[PDB]
Symmetry: D2
Subunit: 254 residues, 4 copies
């Protein structure tokens, strides 16, 4: 039960967004929710998706995580508007189609560094700024994918960016640990989202989960959200630097 | 919230048992609990310990996991007295005192095989039998330790038994996934229990966690119980074959 | 990599297709003295005939059933008296009943489960205790594992747990024997057509999946395992211990 | 092994203490032709003096700052023009500011963080792409990593996240290049006193912990890394790819 908890959720773009799954779960358990977005188009969808939630107040903030000024000023606004928070759900990644849909060995330097900037660095800076709003401690969760642990066809530059993110989670847990701030990841199975449309062969992946994973079915955004809720609450006290695979057991087999 | 849920908890010996930490957390959450024990002293103990719980009635069953018949018959009786269950928490392990200090290379065939029997195989047989009481699906959770993953000083034969258990967990996940039975492990931090006294240089471990793990403190039984609640509930619906470390982040550092 | 003046004990040759015969060809080709242990008389007979492919000037053959403390204890004792001190051991032994290597892992029997732990993991612990006695200046022990010890692989069932056990055995043996300068390591071989492979349900489609999916897009062979064994048993791998090296065309690295 | 008639590229020798020089001593001792790349004018000076310890009939030296695409592309193209096709590349290159390295990891600047990814990870990707044109019939690429890419190690900070990146880079490069028969691997070295070690806070206390705790109860050296590189770079390790071999006295295996 999360009444009188406030969580910031970053990276809802639409109703299929994994972080909207997180939102519905957290809202149902009584949280106050603050949302951040990048595109105009995404603020519009958030305003519409808010009608399905129980939030009596719309707390929306533009934060493009490529800009230090925007993350710093964003979290500062959030602190002035709603006070201290209890956690952040990070659901942000990006890479070019142009590098994604090409050999990994042909990835461009700007492509590679772009994906690292948005998909991994962004957590470090978010954590630094959110830490300011968690003087009593709290919890930070980022969304990763199995392709950060193993080479997966076509995930390419994004696999390297998730490996980097997963380590970022471990170094931040060590660092922020003494401040009672836990940092973890959920390694989500494949889910039809907007971003999923730029992974070559996504449908083939989806079906192979169905055929092969222990549970013989894919997961959805709400199941990510239910585990998010575990990690962001005191239930997962004593759990930090961890990666939870929410993926039908797929990670455990070969 | 676990009202209208029934769980079998194996391996309470005394107030300090990790499984009592589980009992307290589930009991708080409104579950019906069934207990299994090995020796009669754990029974009296247990009868006195359920005075703390809000369990309206004592459901206790002697099961030695070394006996197929005791596992088979015991779960059969559980079904008869209580009907279908929702999950099993496994908190059971044994090695001989001498095999837990000095030199692993000197471990006896009998001691090695004994620790495998009780600490790993017992989970295979329990799963098979408990599955009968879970036609709609359910959740099995076993307790492991970081030594199944890295060679830890002194843990010796138990670390090879844990490594066995952790793969047991993965093979049961794959097998019982199509029946909607999830199987996971909690890798608990060091905790002062009755079995913990059998381990050479326990105290030193305890202190090194406080010094070196991200949270700079030890975990307790209730922290394991809280994550047990997650694994045993629908909150963890898409998670199977997983191992969650409830250990202050210690697994994540070196 | 020259191993003249070196002596190795190779445990678990049953025929020409055995992984250990790959090792033997490689170590022999490199000048090592080789000493062979076997279980069934038929394996010995197969050793006697396969030795005439090697440039070993004599046959050192010892019957060791790793289920028996006496036979391991006495076989190594005897090996030491015949050839002297050794440089290392290559362990290539495992066993499970067929009745437990298909269908449902949740149906494994206790005796089937403990049998596979005994032969396939414990044997390494007692072999290393006895072999230490012949390596007063240090040495190298290498065991043979498979991916299925790390991940649940269809049909490998009771063996995957035995291998998970083995891989942890290697780690604990590494820790405990390091101060004595004995390295302990594991080679994780990809699927190879052997006599024990015949017991693993689905083996053909596992061979074929490696071919289609593994980075090198081909299967590996016993000599490849041998070349990595040569590295692991020799001073080329000083500093390396408690390690698991995958000789599997890269399959472990992909999902 | 034996590496006569083979040609390797070694990137990242600054002085006699560099890991890459250990690699070079071993490969040179084994008969390989060696070609050397460097960034600072000082590193070329050191290389010219270190070449005297080696049996290289010719100095083949090339300035390549891996921050510049044109330098990597041009350098490797000149290498192909001077020495022909090559058999592999040893990559021993990393960098992070002291200023990000010695603050809380959560205080890492964006600039610092991306610099470290560029130099320490991305560089492998473009090296491999350029190196591949000189490997029409296959070859081997080895990069250098540290346990701190697998676990959070105190003070290693921004370099751990860049090693985690480098290690994924290896697997992805492994899968992509497998079918060209180029293998890609990492050596996870234990702590060795070198010029770069001086930027990692707490370094001596880390050395000491290895001594007191690593199974072999001792630290390793540059030459041990190079013996494992010779293995990875030779046909000894055919079948082996996307692998991370720890040359660290067994410390990765313990808690
Ligand atoms: N779908 C899957 O199968 C899968 C599996 C495992 C992990 N994940 C991870 O889950 C997370 C969420 O992705 P998703 O699948 O839910 O796709 P999504 O709905 O497309 O969400 C991705 C989000 O990233 C935000 N974003 C990208 N660049 C940003 C920037 N520079 N500044 C601020 N926000 C930025 C986008 O915002 P704008 O649209 O406003 O630009 C968008 O809301 C990602 O980290 C993804 O890698 C996805
Ligand atoms: N304490 C820790 O730091 C720690 C950390 C990580 C993991 N663990 C794991 O947590 C689990 C519980 O141990 P604990 O620390 O809570 O100590 P504990 O209270 O002493 O519990 C061990 C339990 O195992 C039971 N048991 C042993 N052999 C049995 C058999 N043949 N049949 C039925 N039950 C048997 C014992 O029952 P009887 O006394 O009735 O024989 C006892 O109740 C174990 O699996 C252990 O490996 C402990
Ligand atoms: N082929 C593969 O794809 C594969 C892959 C990875 C790992 N491995 C591993 O490689 C090793 C060798 O197996 P393999 O594939 O080479 O097939 P193999 O030729 O059948 O070798 C198996 C050996 O184990 C021996 N053995 C069984 N129980 C024994 C006992 N109690 N005492 C002494 N020896 C015993 C057998 O001896 P007897 O015939 O005399 O009984 C036989 O020589 C095993 O550890 C296996 O698990 C195999
Ligand atoms: N020493 C250890 O304890 C340790 C442990 C594990 C892994 N490693 C790794 O081993 C590798 C070698 O480092 P080391 O310890 O040998 O220290 P080192 O002697 O200082 O070597 C580092 C090398 O990196 C090169 N380099 C840095 N930036 C470059 C760039 N932008 N373009 C081209 N070259 C560049 C340096 O060249 P210039 O001097 O010309 O600038 C130098 O030759 C690194 O990848 C390091 O992460 C070291
Ligand atoms: C099979 C891939 C599963 C997956 C789907 C969508 C994912 O989201 C992305 C992908 C690329 C760029 C930005 C976000 C993802 O990370 C992982
Ligand atoms: C320091 C090891 C932490 C730990 C404490 C108690 C543990 O429980 C045991 C130990 C030995 C035999 C049977 C059960 C354990 O597995 C692990
Ligand atoms: C795909 C399976 C690869 C493999 C083949 C043979 C193997 O050897 C066995 C198998 C079962 C029992 C005893 C020894 C193996 O371990 C692994
Ligand atoms: C304990 C640290 C071991 C180690 C020492 C030196 C290392 O090389 C570096 C470190 C930081 C920046 C640039 C190169 C290293 O990667 C790892
Ligand atoms: N392959 C993608 C879409 C088209 C493509 O890139 O091949 C998919 O099926 O998900
Ligand atoms: N094709 C496999 C599956 C049959 C089985 O073993 O049950 C085999 O013949 O080994
Ligand atoms: N002691 C450090 C330098 C100073 C620090 O620890 O911050 C070293 O070994 O490089």
């Amino acid at each position: 039960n999360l009444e009188n908890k406030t969580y910031v959720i970053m990276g809802i773009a639409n109703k299929r967004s994994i972080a909207f799954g997180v939102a519905k779960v957290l809202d149902q358990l009584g949280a106050k929710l603050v949302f951040t977005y990048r595109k105009e188009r995404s603020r519009k969808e958030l305003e519409k998706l808010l009608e399905q939630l129980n939030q009596p107040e719309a707390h929306l903030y533009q934060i493009d995580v490529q800009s230090d000024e925007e993350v710093i000023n964003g979290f500062e606004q959030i602190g002035k508007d709603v006070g201290n928070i209890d956690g952040v759900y990070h659901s942000i990644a990006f890479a070019n189609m142009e590098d994604l849909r090409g050999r990994f060995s042909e990835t461009s330097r700007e492509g590679f560094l772009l994906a690292q900037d948005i998909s991994s660095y962004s957590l470090t800076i978010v954590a630094h700024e959110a830490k300011k709003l968690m003087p009593e401690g709290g919890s930070i969760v980022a969304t990763t994918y199995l392709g950060g642990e193993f080479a997966v066809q076509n995930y390419n530059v994004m696999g390297v960016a998730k490996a980097s993110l997963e380590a970022n989670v471990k170094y931040l847990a060590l660092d922020l640990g003494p401040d009672n701030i836990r940092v973890n990841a959920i390694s989500a199975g494949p889910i039809r989202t907007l971003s999923a449309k730029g992974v070559g062969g996504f449908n083939t992946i989806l079906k192979e989960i169905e055929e092969r994973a222990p549970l013989k079915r894919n997961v959805d955004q709400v199941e990510v959200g239910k585990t998010a809720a575990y990690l962001l609450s005191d239930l997962s006290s004593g759990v930090t630097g961890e990666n939870i695979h929410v993926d039908s057991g797929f990670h455990a087999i070969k």
